[PDB]
Design a protein around this ligand. Structure first.
Ligand SMILES: [Hg+2]
Ligand SMILES: [Hg+2]
Ligand SMILES: [Hg+2]
Lengths: 214, 214, 214
């Protein structure tokens, strides 16, 4: 398989209609957020893309979210996948909605792709066409702007990144040097959206280059 | 198996009767501690519970102790398990004693339990009936007080925690948000001991809930 | 196998002849460094030893380099191994040279050794006879001085370290307490070179002790 999509799956999900007040204080949750949606999943960068997407479909924001040390392959149980997102809303109906934009997007939104027919190397070269509060809460991102979200193993990623800046006028806005918790590297770029698509292509060209050879 | 106990095992053990002075300075060890017991083990939270228990049976304190990035399943060798505790004493007899309270407690003290008959999800819902200097050295714990020590994969843990505060008047004293080094989450609660047992039950009810469904 | 060598392998490699200026700024790269060599590999401490060795054969320095959370066994793809080194030079010929000192040294330089015939425990007890800018950039290392670089799982390492200070006048210069990203421990010692070899021996005696028993 060329760059056949990798179908992420949801690993667990629950809503706390009404957080205990004590647990809530420990979370630093605003007064306006008394319901939480919790969601685990197979693929972490995708789940962070679904989360942000939930921020646009519903009235929620992500209270929390972080990944697992050596990936889902190594996860501590079939439940935790390799991410945990914690959405907060003013009530349970808003949070359900955010939960369902997240599921529909994890199952059928952004996706990693195989780097090689051998399906032992994966990557993500995905245009987020309009950013919500999650992705745009990060340094230097404008709310509502387009963005590229690029991920690949360490050497793959560094090269492919360079390649991308060289292929399209974009702005490297964020760079996770190589060892993220899951052991990949990523960066966020910005510019137009037809450019975050020129950029998005050279990155995959460069990841496919290393796979086949480098 | 329902919540059949998981029998932790000790992976290695040695006493340095008399630390090199140079190694000692690098450890920031008091003047009153010239002997070290080193101990590795299968199950990290249990080993931290055994350590604290050693602080009560013998004159030692834990000089060090930390866990391994993706769990014992992923450990770097059959030796290191997924924890390393370093006990310090005024001499080798004290430290042996602490080492032996630790072994007897790792092998037959606190224990994880299976979340599901499928034995792919584990958790820990254990009352520490009286805390020594290790567990009580942590923020807001009283020396000699009771405590609950709750651990579970990320979504399991968050939910189960909320559940517990809601089931018994306890105090969330410490909270390790989701990705600890081993990829679980935990929290310490306090109150009575019959309550750290009401709390300890809803947590397991809530972990069993997600296993079977959520 | 006694302490049969473990043959590290290179997992990927590429040169960016000319970094994009934007990517370069994000790297904090000097004005004197416009070419990068990227290199991934099987064995991280060895690769950090090869890197430093490249600093002596060629005009390059390491711009970056870090390891992967649970080791190459758990790496995110067959490419990233468990390290990423990023060499910088004034041009592509210098960097090629550094890349080739690194390959020749990863494939046939420093090496882990099996702790036990069972080949489930590994370690590294290697004299770096003269240090370049990489290893010597670390606290308290003199440029051009000899050094011991000792690595072993957590309990193995702590013991073996103590053992080494006790066997030869050396100076513990750096100590990575137990859980490095790859889940081993290491330390750098200094003194003579016949001593960093007395030290280097007791460490392996002590790692072999735990393997067979402790
Ligand atoms: Hg893009
Ligand atoms: Hg309890
Ligand atoms: Hg040495």
């Amino acid at each position: 398989p060329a760059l056949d999509l990798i179908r992420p799956s949801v690993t667990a999900m629950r809503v706390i209609a009404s957080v205990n007040a004590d647990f809530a204080r420990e979370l630093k949750l605003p007064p306006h957020i008394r319901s939480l949606g919790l969601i685990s999943a197979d693929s972490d960068d995708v789940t962070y893309i679904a989360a942000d997407e939930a921020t646009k479909q519903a009235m929620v924001e992500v209270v929390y979210g972080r990944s697992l040390y050596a990936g889902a392959a190594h996860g501590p149980s079939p439940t935790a996948g390799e991410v945990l997102i914690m959405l907060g809303g003013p009530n349970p109906a808003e949070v359900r909605a955010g939960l369902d934009a997240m599921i529909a997007h994890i199952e059928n939104g952004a996706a990693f792709q195989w780097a090689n027919d051998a399906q032992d190397t994966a990557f993500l070269a995905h245009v987020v066409s309009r950013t919500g509060s999650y992705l745009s809460s990060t340094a230097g991102i404008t709310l509502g702007d387009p963005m590229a979200y690029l991920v690949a193993p360490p050497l793959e990623a560094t090269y492919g990144i360079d390649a991308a800046l060289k292929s399209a006028d974009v702005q490297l806005a964020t760079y996770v040097p190589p060892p993220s918790e899951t052991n990949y590297s990523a960066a966020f770029l910005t510019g137009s959206q037809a450019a975050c698509k020129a950029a998005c292509n050279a990155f995959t060209d460069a990841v496919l280059e290393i796979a086949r050879n480098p």
